[PDB]
Amino acid sequence: MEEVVLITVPSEEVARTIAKALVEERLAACVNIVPGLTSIYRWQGEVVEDQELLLLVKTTTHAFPKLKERVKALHPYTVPEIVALPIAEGNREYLDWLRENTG
Amino acid sequence: MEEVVLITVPSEEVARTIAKALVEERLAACVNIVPGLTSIYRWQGEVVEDQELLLLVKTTTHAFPKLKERVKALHPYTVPEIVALPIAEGNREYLDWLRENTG
Amino acid sequence: MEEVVLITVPSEEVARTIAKALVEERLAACVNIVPGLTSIYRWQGEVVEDQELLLLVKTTTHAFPKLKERVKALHPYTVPEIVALPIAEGNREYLDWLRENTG
């Protein structure tokens, strides 16, 4: 089954490097980089704020384990956000393309 | 039945044309246009990069068939991205509004 | 179950107010604020436009009830958009951190 994976990154350099690696390695068919995020989260009991970018990764459920391994290898954070949202339905031509361009 | 549909487009013009049509035609209760995307994907087997915008469509599975048809008619890409993410739960009054303002 | 909640707000001021509150109150582990949204939606027989910002809230189904309550108390809209998308799978360490920082 196809999924849209969300990944937040600290900079455009990390956004581009991870985005390119995932597509190049066939772990994703496409990756969108959304810039300008202001992120507020908890870290060791403190609430902190930082500027980030969001990656939207179009991939499949069986590509997830390797995708995670590669993202962790490239991401500067010890616990990076990598969460997959299920694609309940989509246009057939697109889903076929996604499948054909992954794995 | 409620879902959030993601569609990427090449320009603000196409974004607005599609957003307007979907809500006007009761295929969506609302559409968010997110600008500034950088997209990295597979085309003809090779890795390319392009600039795009993201549409977040609030709709339902009942509206999806016609939504797909209309997006394809109004979208320049040969294979446009039209993927639905399911809404697992939400503010009751908002979901009621979404269901009422769609179809 | 872990979820990504979407909320649209009218200004950065409301975005920040809700973002800080949910995280400080442990109703969410992190909140991303995405600016620059153009929203096209239905108001009766009219298709209207407005500027907004998007909040991506990392939380759980268990915090959702209280999260909805707090968002409504801090949101100027009569019917704020609060919809949850299910996280099918994710980086184990990340989901652990998410659950440990939300109640």
From Swiss-Prot, chains A, B, C:
GO CC annotation: what is one?
Answer: cytoplasm
Q: What family does this belong to?
A: Belongs to the CutA family.
From which domain of life does this come?
Answer: Bacteria
Q: Which SUPFAM superfamilies does this UniProt record tie to the protein?
A: GlnB-like
Quaternary arrangement and interactors, per the entry? Homotrimer.
The record's subcellular location field reads: Cytoplasm
| MF terms (GO), sorted A to Z | copper ion binding
Q: Where is the signal peptide?
A: none
Gene that this sequence comes from? cutA
Question: Which keywords describe this protein according to UniProt?
Answer: Cytoplasm
GO BP field: response to metal ion
Know the name of this protein?
Divalent-cation tolerance protein CutA
Its biological purpose: Involved in resistance toward heavy metals.
Q: Does the keyword Transcription apply?
A: no
